């Protein structure tokens, strides 16, 4: 018997005002 | 017997005002 | 017996005002 | 018998005003 | 019998005003 | 001036003999 | 001037014989 | 002037014989 | 002038014979 | 002028025979 529930994975749980930059989850190299 | 439920995966659970930038989940290289 | 339900995958669960930028799920290279 | 529940993984649980920089989860190299 | 619950992993549980820098979870090399 | 090239993203760069299991890129929940 | 190149992201760079198990990149919950 | 190159991210750079278990990159909860 | 190169991130650089267990990069909770 | 190169991050640089246990990079809670 296996009971698995209610897992979650959020990257950004909130509110942003005036995002002029970068919100990136996974980057390899590159220039921001 | 297997019971799996209520998993979730969100990247951005929230509200944005005036997004002038970048909201990226997975980038490889490149310039923001 | 297998019981799997109520999984979900959202990228952007919220509201945006004046999106002048980029909202990208998965990019490989390239210039924003 | 296995009972696993209510795990979570957030990167950013909060609110940002005027994000002019970078919010990156996992970077390899590159210039910010 | 196994009972595991309510684990969590946050990187940034708080609010930022005027982020002009970098908030990075895991970097290998590179220039900030 | 922007010069971005030669990015790549592979999940499985190799050879498999007698795959009787599962090779999955991104799963949410469920039983293997 | 921006010069970004030759980034890569592999999950499995190699060879497998007789895969009877699971090779998963990103799982949320669930039973293997 | 920005010069970024030759970044890489591998999870499994090698060979496996008789994989009867699990090779998982990122799991949240669940039973192996 | 910025010169960044040859960064890498491997989790498993080697060979496995008869993997009957678990090779997991990042787990939150759960039973192995 | 910035010159950064040849950084690396490995978790397991070697070979395993008969892995019947667990090889985990980062766990929060849970039972092995």
Author numbering:
A (entry chain F), B (entry chain H), C (entry chain J), D (entry chain D), E (entry chain B), F (entry chain I), ...: 9 to 40
Give sentences copied directly from the paper behind this entry:
Alzheimer’s disease is the most common form of dementia and is neuropathologically defined by the presence of extracellular plaques containing Aβ in the brain parenchyma and intraneuronal neurofibrillary tangles containing phosphorylated tau. Peptides between 37 and 43 residues in length are generated, with those of 40 (Aβ40) and 42 (Aβ42) residues in length being the most abundant. These Aβ monomers tend to aggregate into insoluble fibrils, the structure of which has been extensively studied in vitro by cryogenic-electron microscopy (cryo-EM) and solid-state nuclear magnetic resonance spectroscopy, revealing a spectrum of different polymorphs. Two human fibril polymorphs have been determined: ‘type I filaments’, which are mostly associated with sporadic Alzheimer’s disease (SAD), and ‘type II filaments’, which are observed in familial Alzheimer’s disease (FAD) and other neurodegenerative disorders with amyloid brain pathology. Here, we determined the structures of nine ex vivo Aβ fibrils from six different mouse models by cryogenic-electron microscopy.
